[PDB]
Amino acid sequence: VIKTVLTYQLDGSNRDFNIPFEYLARKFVVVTLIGVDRKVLTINTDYRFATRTTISLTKAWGPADGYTTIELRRVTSTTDRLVDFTDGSILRAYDLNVAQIQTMHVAEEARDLTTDTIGVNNDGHLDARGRRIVNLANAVDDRDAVPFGQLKTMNQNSWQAR
Amino acid sequence: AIVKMSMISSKVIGLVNPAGITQPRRLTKAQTGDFVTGRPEDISFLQLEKQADFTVAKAVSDAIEARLSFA
């Protein structure tokens, strides 16, 4: 029920930020500062993990710099596994649980990413699945084939053209 | 080959043993005399050890030059 992104808005100057999900290691939590470009902030230079689930930035990075979203996505590596089993080990229950958690984190991240897409189905139909296409202002211009909500006022005007 | 070996020989490099105590900074920043702390064995210079090959090359070159001059 909790997404892995929780895209934020700068809404002025803010420093402290929160993440809703849980991560095995802070190497699997990326903070891409989007807005004018896909700017991504690395660790130790722009990052600061004051405490678990309270990521904070060095400065505000307000909209004045052209950055409006800081989506805190979570990506778990599928090549660098947290626990790899060996025939001479003890088989800690903590090991088995960590392995299942990481694999579930990789799959839930790959099911959330793919489910938020538009594409054809086996029948050969692409469905939005009842997902409103918000944030497409200025829709149309040389017959771009979509409105952005001004259709209401335009049709009101045309209704009383007489 | 001989000329290139000579050019190799011309270059001078100061090989200072790290295990030693002589520090080249006090060698460079010192006028004539000016007793300095260090040991002579620490400072060594790279050399072109290729000598016997030089002798045989010179012998062959001399023989070729002699036959050509006769020719």
């Binding site: - | 000329v3 000579s6 050019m7 011309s10």
Partner: protein
């Protein structure tokens, strides 16, 4: 500037002096193709090339190497 050139027709060398833009009417000498008193010189003549190729030109490598060694 003193410029001498072959006559475009079946003529001899034409000589004139140019000081600044315009020549000087005083200098209008004409000399035969044979007795030209300017006499350009060349030490080593090579076909195509108009002049040059000094004697030391083909020993410049020896001078380079010897000077490097002596330095």
């Amino acid at each position: 500037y003193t410029h001498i050139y072959l006559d475009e027709d079946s003529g001899e060398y034409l000589r004139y002096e140019e000081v600044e833009g315009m020549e000087v009417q005083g200098s209008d000498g004409t000399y035969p193709k044979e007795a030209c008193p300017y006499i350009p010189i060349r030490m080593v003549r090579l076909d195509g090339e108009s002049y040059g190729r000094s004697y030391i030109e083909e020993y410049l490598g020896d001078l380079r190497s010897l000077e490097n060694l002596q330095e």
